[PDB]
Amino acid sequence: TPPELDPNTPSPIFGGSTGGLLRKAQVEEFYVITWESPKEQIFEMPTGGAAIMREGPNLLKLARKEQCLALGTRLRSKYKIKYQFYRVFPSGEVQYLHPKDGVYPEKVNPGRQGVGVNFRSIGKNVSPIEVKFTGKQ
Amino acid sequence: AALYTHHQYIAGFIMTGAFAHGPIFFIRDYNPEQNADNVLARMLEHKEAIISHLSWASLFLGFHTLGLYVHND
Amino acid sequence: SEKPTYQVVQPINGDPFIGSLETPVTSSPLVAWYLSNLPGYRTAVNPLLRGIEVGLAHGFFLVGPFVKAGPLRNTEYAGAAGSLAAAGLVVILSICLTIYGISSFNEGDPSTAPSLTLTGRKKQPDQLQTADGWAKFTGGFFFGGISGVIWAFFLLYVLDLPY
Amino acid sequence: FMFLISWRGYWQELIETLAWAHERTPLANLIRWRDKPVALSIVQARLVGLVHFSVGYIFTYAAFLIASTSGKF
Amino acid sequence: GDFLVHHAIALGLHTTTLILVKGALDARGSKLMPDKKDFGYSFPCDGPGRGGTCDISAWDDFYLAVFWMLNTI
Amino acid sequence: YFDLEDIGNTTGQWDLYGSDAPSPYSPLQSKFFETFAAPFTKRGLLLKFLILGGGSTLAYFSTTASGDILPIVKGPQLPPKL
Amino acid sequence: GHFSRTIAKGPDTTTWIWNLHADAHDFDSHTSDLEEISRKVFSAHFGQLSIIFLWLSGMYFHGARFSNYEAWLNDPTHIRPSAQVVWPIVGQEILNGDVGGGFRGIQITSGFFQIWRASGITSELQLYCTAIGALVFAGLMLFAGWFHYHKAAPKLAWFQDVESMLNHHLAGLLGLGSLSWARHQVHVSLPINQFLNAGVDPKEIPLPHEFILNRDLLAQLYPSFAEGATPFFTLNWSKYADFLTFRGGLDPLTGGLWLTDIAHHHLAIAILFLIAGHMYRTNWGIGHGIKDILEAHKGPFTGQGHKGLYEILTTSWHAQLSINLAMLGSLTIVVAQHMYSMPPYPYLATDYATQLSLFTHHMWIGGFLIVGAAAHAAIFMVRDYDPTTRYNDLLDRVLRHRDAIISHLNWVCIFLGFHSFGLYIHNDTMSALGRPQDMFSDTAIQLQPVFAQWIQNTHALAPGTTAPGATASTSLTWGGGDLVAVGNKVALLPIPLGTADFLVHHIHAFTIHVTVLILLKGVLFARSSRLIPDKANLGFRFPCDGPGRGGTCQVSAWDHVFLGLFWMYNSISVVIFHFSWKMQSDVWGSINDQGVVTHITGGNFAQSSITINGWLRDFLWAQASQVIQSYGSSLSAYGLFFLGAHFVWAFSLMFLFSGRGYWQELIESIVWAHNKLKVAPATQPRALSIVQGRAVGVTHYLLGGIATTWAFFLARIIAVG
Amino acid sequence: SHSVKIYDTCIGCTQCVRACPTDVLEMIPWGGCKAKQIASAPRTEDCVGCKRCESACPTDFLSVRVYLWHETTRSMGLAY
Ligand code: CLA
Ligand code: CLA
Ligand code: CLA
Ligand code: CLA
Ligand SMILES: CCCCCCCCCCCCCCCC(=O)OC[C@H](COP(=O)(O)OC[C@@H](O)CO)OC(=O)CCCCCCCCCCCCCCC
Ligand SMILES: CC1=C(C/C=C(\C)CCC[C@H](C)CCC[C@H](C)CCCC(C)C)C(=O)c2ccccc2C1=O
């Protein structure tokens, strides 16, 4: 799948809060989320309250990644809305995470790679052993 | 008075340490296979017996010692 | 952004996704003008000069409390020599300043301070930070503090107002 | 008792507000921490609380054991 | 008077031993957490799943016994 | 509305709050301070001077007439059993 | 779970049983139908009123048959008020003690005896009737709830008409209620009590109804009643001033407020609530739309404001419950501090045992209700807050700068804590090192509360100057040189304020601010937080969200009420302590023939309450001697409950310092022993839930702690007063 | 960061994924069960370690196990 990319989009109406980005964004990382609304609706917005959704591309910048998903998972419910978020970084860069595969993680997809799958089954783990590793490899 | 009270608290904490390095032995250094069906490995296979009777003995002592006291008051 | 806003609480510098807001306390010309001035602020000025202002002011301020509420309030012998105490504090306070300055190195990638004003002018750097800059500033504080201390004692060790 | 009754999630959320504060306070912005301010861990608090509990336990009785006995002899 | 207190102490011993051996015999795991062996002597917990798993490590069982030890002494 | 990957700074609270002031300077009296505050500007050297300045505390306590270090005199209590 | 079908379903674990009671009254979790809920709670209030009505019936009944009220009436100064008697079983009869009047019973502190004398009640016959009348009402109230849930339940539209409800409640209940009681006073209370103060004896008093029928008996005293036409219709009103006055102060013979004033009070209160009753809009035109007026207020700072409030407070019970609990609790507190300073009952102030227990009881009830406001406010945020349908904007912003409010309130508590408790640690250290000059004391560096001392000063010089009609002061704590002494006891006296009084007030400032902090933090961050962006989806009452993020224990709004619950205890617990010592040390005592007054502890408050050691010795250790030496006497029960509370208290620490993971594993070993002997219950035993263990913990902590002082205080004042 | 593992005792009910708020897990084609899916833990870097996934697992004891390891800003759940 090819990541779509985000360039410029308008931000939803809100007026400000004290739960926004703070320094971490400047020096480590900050996460942005994009979704399209068929109507200028009203959504809760985590770390604050009441913001108008807007109609169009809709671009929002948040922190922790998790804040974006919470909004996104609420965005998929209530309103039938598709969404995507990325990790901006401080020096440009384009890291796109979620959906990623382009199909939701909960929905099985054809070529993902297992990563950290144990075909032993739990309870068959060993006991140390002063060697490196913990046995739940 | 000081010396007795001193050593009893020292003896106290030490006992909790002997009972603390016990579990650590089981988790970090215990080899179940090398200790197959020996006196040590037999403690884990009837552990519910030792614990329950300690519960009973504790519940017994508490129910009456406290009972006899409150009664007297 | 003036002046039919008819409301106060403009989102911080127009950004409503950065935490903080604009309030008279945050941004009032009187406050802003006030904040812009002072040794801590006033970037583009020698750090040593700024420390002196700050250092000198604090040292002078510290004497009053120590002398008045000291263990010898209350004594000719400790008539104000306790100011010595105020001085000791600035000796200690200069250590804390010095050790903190070691969190900034001499490489030093000078300045962790922002590189732009609001209005996003995009111009200039600060320099208070960095090893050389911070050290000068402490030295100023030490100098400023010890002095402020002596002077305040001076007037008191004469006084007449108010006895 | 504070570290034993009150638990972490309350304190962590409290510190997060204090982290915001320090950042938005003039004349204090110039100074920054080198270590991220976080609430004590779940196990750490149980320890720290137990240490307080044990120290006060000993010191109180120590103060009483000596004085009450020393006073009368 | 010496009768009741000796039973109180006997109560203190049994209960403290109950807490300590239970932490030892269940250090490698129980039915609420069969793979406790894989987490070490000291870990915060295993989460609120399966009803809740607060103070389930062998370390915490020690930490609970220290209270009872202080009471006994 | 205004996010620009080009400048990551304005995007964040990178900007110095208007409290910054990069204006002129202060009177020439500085020429004096710069001369006499120099030895304390070195850092590390100052760290030491202040710590060894703790030699003052030793001097101040070795010689101190009015701190309670004397009974002044009394006849001590025996006292519970002598 | 009876309330819900799936909930009722079946029991598989013991957790089902605990859940069943935990969500018994959680009406909004059983249905989403607002009308069904409202119908439920409305009937529930009836069932409540029945219980308190039955409660009243037993108080009047016991006063009639099991009390020495008549005996106390003739000799109120040294007869001990006692209701309820104990059957002579397994050695119980020792709790029946000498209370005077040739009667054996437990001395009481409810204060009903003082209430009954004020009402002009004279015989058990009268108490007997009032008990029955209460039972008759209890039968009604219970029946009324059954009728309004199964026969004729009101529409949701009925409950929503708040305007009509407001007009009535502060006029139909308050106004006429005050007016009706105002009538009983001048017709029954005032005439009969006037006799009682003349030492006429109750049986020699004519019956109340004889005062009403013929004016003759009521007119010889208070001769304004003589005119049949009455000067009321003449609208001069100056003539009436004999039975009602603005005298204030305190009657030097009965030690209570002049009923001569309380009647006038209610007369004013009544119509003041009758006029204010004519405010909101209904059907016949004249009135206000509270919806309209609320909308009008807006501001440069608030933008739209209050718009939408009317919608919120007409569709959400928890919103209304929080507001009501916040002030009903606050009202109970100001009641405690108005009844001590202005004794409204005959021979009330003289009865020290009743006053301590009255003030202390109202402080806890007031304290608890306020904490409950925090809960339902947080419940509203989790369950009823919807910006899409019911935006307010006031609520917004608050949520917008919530990290600000908490951070500041966090600082104030640290400032207060240092500048309160620290001063004591200072004094404790300076006194131990042998330097009292250094301490914060009246004898050394003093911190005089000149502001409070100034307000009191203007209250003293108020009658005549800024209060012409007032002959005497409001309360004698603002008197100046006055002193009321009923019996050989001191009813009241000007209360001084020193440096010792400066410290303790600052401790109350503290404890209240911290309690506010914990509770307010839980309400604002009930839905979202930087730590937990979706806390609202976890609900209001959940244990946590795992050990992740370093640990997220007690992030729920429920747990914030849990933590703030101990602090409300810590708070009041020191208010009542302030009350107890200050009153005993500088107010309560015996007055001699010469006029010399000796207080119970002898003015040791000023220089010994500035030290921590001073409270632990001169207050606790000293004033305990009563409770710990009450064995073999009538106050035997207090000694036991003192020990009994210390236990349920230390019993709470078992639940508070531990977690359920240990207990469940312990049960496993115990279930094994059962399965060996065929004695394993089909309903599998489970440990308490993470949240329940906290609920169990705090209840026992509050019970053992509160109960423990209860026995403290009640043993102290009875043996001494 | 935190260490998460999946076990073949899984039955592919996908509840561990829906529970995660940081998107640490995902479903994978497999031949081991009737669902023919299996959980995967590719993005452990974003794992906070809250064990929401474990409280959704229906397998007799967890098929997904979270082992709290080294702490990072992401794992610490910090927004500052
Ligand atoms: C927090 C409560 C508290 C307070 C108010 C005090 C106060 C005092 N202590 Mg104590 N002490 C305390 C707790 C406290 N102590 C505790 C808990 C202990 C246990 C160890 C002690 C042990 C102790 C000892 C052994 C001694 C004292 C002594 C003193 C006196 C002199 C100390 C001093 O250096 O002046 C203070 C120095 C300062 C630099 C004060 C600066 C603070 C200023 C006022 C802040 C102003 C804020 C301002 C509004 C900022 C914004 C302004 C804006 C407009 C710009 C002073 C009355 C001494 C004494 O009294 O001897 C007889 C003494 O020997 N204390
Ligand atoms: C006259 C007899 C009578 C009968 C046969 C019923 C029967 C019923 N009621 Mg009704 N009810 C009655 C009187 C009666 N009620 C009265 C007088 C009131 C006014 C308070 C109510 C108010 C009421 C409400 C609001 C509801 C019902 C409901 C019900 C149905 C379910 C029962 C239930 O709630 O669960 C439990 C049964 C109990 C008896 C619970 C105990 C509650 C009592 C009052 C406790 C007494 C207080 C106690 C003394 C407190 C001190 C305790 C102390 C010892 C510690 C059932 C058909 C429910 C329903 O319709 O289902 C959806 C329902 O919502 N009732
Ligand atoms: C205005 C009065 C009022 C009303 C009408 C309600 C109503 C409600 N509350 Mg609330 N509450 C109040 C005041 C009030 N509360 C105050 C003042 C506080 C602060 C302490 C609280 C704290 C609170 C919490 C934390 C919760 C509620 C909850 C609820 C809801 C259902 C819970 C339930 O069924 O009870 C269940 C009853 C029990 C479990 C009985 C417990 C045993 C008691 C506490 C022991 C009392 C000891 C006794 C007095 C002395 C010892 C006697 C013994 C030795 C024999 C229900 C809407 C729950 C909710 O989720 O809201 C929807 C919830 O969790 N309340
Ligand atoms: C005073 C407080 C207190 C009390 C009474 C207990 C009591 C007990 N603890 Mg505990 N504990 C406490 C504090 C306390 N603990 C604290 C502060 C901690 C540190 C967190 C612990 C940590 C701890 C651990 C780790 C363990 C215990 C265990 C036990 C049980 C030991 C069995 C026994 O000896 O007697 C039996 C019971 C009693 C003596 C008390 C029962 C209470 C009365 C007697 C019951 C009668 C009820 C009566 C009818 C009143 C009815 C009320 C009415 C409303 C219905 C016993 C229940 C152990 C256990 O569970 O063994 C099975 C155990 O594992 N405790
Ligand atoms: C030295 C002794 C002199 C005393 C002065 C200092 C002591 C008093 C403290 C000053 C506080 C300023 C109040 C301004 C009066 C005031 O509150 O103005 C209220 C102001 C008015 O807003 P609006 O005009 O919009 O109001 C109408 C509409 O908004 C509502 O429909 O609203 C705000 O200020 C919003 C920001 C809240 C401000 C938060 C500050 C809260 C202070 C907290 C301390 C409470 C102390 C209570 C003690 C009993
Ligand atoms: C107060 C509190 C905090 C906040 C505690 C913090 C932030 C600890 C910081 C303490 C400050 C730094 C002062 C402590 C000074 C000590 C005397 C340390 C001395 C230095 C060495 C001896 C280590 C928690 O994080 C917590 C977590 C879980 C359960 C309960 C609690 C809890 O009660």
Ligand SMILES: CC1=C(C/C=C(\C)CCC[C@H](C)CCC[C@H](C)CCCC(C)C)C(=O)c2ccccc2C1=O
């Ligand atoms: C002791 C304790 C338990 C165990 C305590 C329990 C399970 C209390 C419930 C036991 C009751 C008393 C047993 C019920 C017995 C039935 C009522 C049957 C009785 C039959 C006759 C005697 C009437 C926890 O589960 C727990 C959980 C979280 C934090 C702390 C703790 C905690 O401290």
